[PDB]
Design a protein around this motif. Structure first.
Motif, mmCIF file in Angstrom:
data_model
loop_
_atom_site.group_PDB
_atom_site.id
_atom_site.type_symbol
_atom_site.label_atom_id
_atom_site.label_comp_id
_atom_site.label_asym_id
_atom_site.label_seq_id
_atom_site.Cartn_x
_atom_site.Cartn_y
_atom_site.Cartn_z
ATOM 1 N N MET A 83 -7.063 -1.098 6.716
ATOM 2 C CA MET A 83 -6.638 -2.453 6.550
ATOM 3 C C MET A 83 -6.117 -2.920 5.259
ATOM 4 S SD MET A 83 -9.666 -4.613 8.540
ATOM 5 C CE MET A 83 -9.200 -6.061 7.358
ATOM 6 N N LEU A 84 -5.926 -1.971 4.498
ATOM 7 C CA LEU A 84 -5.321 -2.454 3.152
ATOM 8 C C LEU A 84 -3.922 -2.829 3.072
ATOM 9 C CD1 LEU A 84 -5.910 -2.461 0.049
ATOM 10 C CD2 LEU A 84 -5.392 -0.315 -0.018
ATOM 11 N N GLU A 143 -8.437 3.397 -2.534
ATOM 12 C CA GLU A 143 -8.938 2.769 -1.636
ATOM 13 C C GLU A 143 -8.541 3.243 -0.225
ATOM 14 O OE1 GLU A 143 -11.676 0.327 -0.544
ATOM 15 O OE2 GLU A 143 -10.907 1.301 1.166
ATOM 16 N N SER A 178 -8.872 2.585 3.108
ATOM 17 C CA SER A 178 -9.086 1.785 4.269
ATOM 18 C C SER A 178 -7.726 1.420 4.984
ATOM 19 C CB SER A 178 -9.679 0.284 3.987
ATOM 20 O OG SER A 178 -9.197 -0.661 4.820
ATOM 21 N N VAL A 231 -10.867 -3.512 -5.049
ATOM 22 C CA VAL A 231 -10.646 -2.334 -4.584
ATOM 23 C C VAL A 231 -10.263 -1.339 -5.597
ATOM 24 C CG1 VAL A 231 -10.151 -3.060 -2.450
ATOM 25 C CG2 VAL A 231 -8.077 -2.492 -3.916
ATOM 26 N N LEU A 282 -6.548 -7.261 2.285
ATOM 27 C CA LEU A 282 -7.115 -6.379 3.297
ATOM 28 C C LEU A 282 -7.028 -7.432 4.514
ATOM 29 C CD1 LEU A 282 -9.361 -5.919 0.774
ATOM 30 C CD2 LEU A 282 -9.379 -3.998 2.545
ATOM 31 N N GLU A 295 0.862 -1.297 -0.006
ATOM 32 C CA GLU A 295 0.081 -0.090 -0.113
ATOM 33 C C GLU A 295 0.696 1.108 -0.050
ATOM 34 O OE1 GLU A 295 0.136 1.657 3.442
ATOM 35 O OE2 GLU A 295 -0.793 3.399 2.187
#
Length: 107
Positions: A85-86, A81, A83, A77, A67, A48
């Motif tokens: 949690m990515l 994205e 998030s 995704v 994730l 990420e």
């Protein structure tokens, strides 16, 4: 069982700018199922924090998202994205450095 995971070896890309396909969400769902059965030959994992390495024609279309830590869920995704949690993205490319082990299941 949807809780069951599998272990996969995937090439990791932290160094290379990659142009990759992005697809409608239903096509990415199908690629995830395909890769979960047959492995990830032809894909690389982009962490990420390296997401700026990845380019595609349509920013509104989907790539494979990873994730959660430990055993990660695979989910379509967008490259934006947000998030927390990515972990990163699995994208169709051959540019990368090291092979890493991933424990994964389908979202």
């Amino acid at each position: 069982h949807h809780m069951s995971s599998k272990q996969f070896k995937i090439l990791v890309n932290e160094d290379y700018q990659v142009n990759v396909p992005s697809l409608p969400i239903r096509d990415v769902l199908q690629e995830i199922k395909y890769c979960y059965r047959n492995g990830f030959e032809g894909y690389v994992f982009v962490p990420e924090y390296c997401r700026d390495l990845v380019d595609c024609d349509r920013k509104d279309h989907y790539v494979i998202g990873v994730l959660g830590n430990g055993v990660s869920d695979l989910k379509p995704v967008l490259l934006t994205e947000p998030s927390v949690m990515l972990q990163g993205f699995i994208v169709r490319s051959g540019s990368g450095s090291v092979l890493e082990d991933f424990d994964l299941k389908i979202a």
